[PDB]
Amino acid sequence: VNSFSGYLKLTDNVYIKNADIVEEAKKVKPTVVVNAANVYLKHGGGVAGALNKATNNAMQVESDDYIATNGPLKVGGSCVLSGHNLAKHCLHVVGPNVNKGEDIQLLKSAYENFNQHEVLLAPLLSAGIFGADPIHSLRVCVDTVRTNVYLAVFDKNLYDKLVSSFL
Ligand SMILES: Fc1ccccc1[C@H]1CCN(c2ncnc3[nH]ccc23)C1
């Protein structure tokens, strides 16, 4: 039993809700919140900009030190950093950005990072400003993640479309 409330169950391990991931994280304080990161951990917009804003820029400060030490992530890769006031940990995961020409096949590799964590609150990878089809992202999520994932979808119209079209 966990504290996630109001989710629709899609499969044995995948759950979905129309929710602002920032507000959901503040309420649940999950062990892991996933950020829709880029390789430079520059949290300017989309989910990343919103999560970082909610940390009063502490996420960005921590991220800049991470990059100065380690260099950029790989597309499809991840790193674990602090969750600040939102979660115990933040798993920064880099899905391919279609608006940069990145290979959509890397979306499966990106979701594989979730399997290192028993339970996660997450957005749909590569959706939103990353330019991928969110229906496809949900399909890859369900077919790749084996741990327990609670997906927050900000847009109500998109949420209804994802549910109604789910096979
Ligand atoms: F822009 C993006 C970049 C990368 C991945 C996804 C997006 C879109 C699609 C879903 N998404 C969100 N989902 C849940 N909570 C949210 N809070 C603020 C934004 C947001 C924004």
UniProtKB/Swiss-Prot annotation:
Consequence of substituting T31A: In strain: Mu/B.1.621
Membrane-topology descriptor: Multi-pass membrane protein
Location in or out of the cell: Host endoplasmic reticulum membrane
Activation and inhibition: Inhibited in vitro by GRL-0617.
Domain called Macro: residue spans: 1-167
Catalysed reactions, as listed in the record: Thiol-dependent hydrolysis of ester, thioester, amide, peptide and isopeptide bonds formed by the C-terminal Gly of ubiquitin (a 76-residue protein attached to proteins as an intracellular targeting signal)
Protein's job: Responsible for the cleavages located at the N-terminus of the replicase polyprotein. Participates together with nsp4 in the assembly of virally-induced cytoplasmic double-membrane vesicles necessary for viral replication. Antagonizes innate immune induction of type I interferon by blocking the phosphorylation, dimerization and subsequent nuclear translocation of host IRF3. Also prevents host NF-kappa-B signaling. In addition, PL-PRO possesses a deubiquitinating/deISGylating activity and processes both 'Lys-48'- and 'Lys-63'-linked polyubiquitin chains from cellular substrates.
Quaternary structure annotation from Swiss-Prot or TrEMBL: May form homohexamers. Interacts with N protein.
Name of the protein in its database record: Papain-like protease nsp3
Organism per entry: Severe acute respiratory syndrome coronavirus 2 (2019-nCoV)
Residues of the full protein shown: 1025 to 1191 of 7096
